[PDB]
Design a protein around this ligand. Structure first.
Ligand SMILES: Oc1cccc(-c2nnc(NCc3c(F)cccc3Cl)[nH]2)c1
Length: 343
């Protein structure tokens, strides 16, 4: 039952993988050919997955998330393996997924798309988001670089459970921050699923115009760009900013009304403008949800309420648990050896 493994050094790291995977090429992630399925695959070798409690829990988190996702528009797990033959030997985890053709950041850089492509790409993101949000999974980091497409314009959402960004990585004129909802960028309040809809709005705007919507040079500049478009917060939203210091700062800004989005997105389909106004609402309680957006008339060409499935429940009670490294490692090992490949 255990396959035979073979070893290869690739950019100064030993990769040990079942024989079915051939033509490993660095892209740590390698592209490869799964001779058993005929699929072009991406293979991620986790770096030192059990070196600390925080790392061991992150390894378990990523594997739990990838094992759960079973949806056309979300990256799922084709395989997971370790060369270890016992829990005692277990120190390496490899994750195998479909290899997509390219990501939106690489394909659509500086380019506006036709309206039909914006409809189809945003439709597919929202279909995937309906699925993940129905499991109370929040992506939290949607941006063009973790949205991948194939040559048929079919899209998958990537990168779940990744290591939380450092302060330096979120600093300055950086795409790591341009798509974040203001309540998470400035820690206004406990955030929820609606943060992902803000990112979809920023992404949809950029597909329509070819331009970053809120290319802030830093957190404060970005907030000013945001509030110029959507207006400064009103009294109801201010009360929900539980961060007293954040609430006090935003009240120091001169009040500004929401702009006319038809004058910002000149020439765009009025249905696209309407949908953007319903996504890019400052108060997260009032943003359109993914399920609601799928029924918006902008997507009339694509919407099928019988083919927009929800997810099985996802138990993430482990998130609140404090365990030892070897306990996270044992949980991870159970998930590796119980993996069942998809059809
Ligand atoms: O930014 C790009 C561009 C082209 C393909 C890809 C791509 N295709 N499949 C993936 N999967 C990456 C991956 C793993 F390899 C393992 C676990 C999770 C993920 Cl997202 N990435 C990403």
């Amino acid at each position: 039952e255990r396959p035979t493994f073979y070893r290869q050094e690739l950019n100064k790291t030993i990769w040990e993988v079942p024989e079915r995977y051939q033509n490993l090429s660095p892209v740590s992630v390698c592209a490869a050919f799964d001779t058993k399925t005929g699929l072009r695959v991406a293979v991620k070798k986790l770096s030192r997955p059990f070196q600390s409690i925080i790392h061991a829990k992150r390894t378990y988190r990523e594997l739990r998330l990838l094992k759960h996702m079973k949806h056309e528009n979300v990256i799922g797990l084709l395989d997971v393996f370790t060369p270890a033959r016992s829990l005692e030997e277990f120190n390496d985890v490899y994750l195998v997924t479909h290899l997509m053709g390219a990501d939106l950041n690489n394909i659509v850089k500086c380019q506006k798309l036709t309206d039909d492509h914006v409809q189809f790409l945003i439709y597919q993101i929202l279909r995937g988001l309906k699925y993940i949000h129905s499991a109370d999974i929040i992506h939290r980091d949607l941006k063009p670089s973790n949205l991948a497409v194939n040559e048929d314009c079919e899209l998958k959402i990537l990168d779940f459970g990744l290591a939380r960004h450092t302060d330096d990585e979120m600093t300055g004129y950086v795409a790591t921050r341009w798509y974040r909802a203001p309540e998470i960028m400035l820690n206004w309040m406990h955030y929820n699923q609606t943060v992902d809809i803000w990112s979809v709005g920023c992404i949809m705007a950029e597909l329509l115009t070819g331009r970053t919507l809120f290319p802030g040079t830093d957190h404060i500049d970005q907030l000013k760009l945001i509030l110029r478009l959507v207006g400064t917060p009103g009294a109801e939203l201010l009360k929900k900013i539980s961060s007293e210091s954040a609430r006090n700062y935003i009240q120091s800004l001169t009040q500004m009304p929401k702009m006319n989005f038809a004058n910002v997105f000149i020439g765009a389909n009025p249905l696209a403008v309407d949908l953007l106004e319903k996504m890019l609402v400052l108060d997260s309680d009032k943003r359109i949800t993914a399920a609601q957006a799928l029924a918006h008339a902008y997507f009339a060409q694509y919407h099928d309420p019988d083919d927009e499935p929800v997810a099985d429940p996802y138990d993430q009670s482990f998130e609140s648990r404090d365990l030892l490294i070897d306990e996270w490692k044992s949980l991870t090992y159970d998930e590796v050896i119980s993996f069942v490949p998809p059809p």
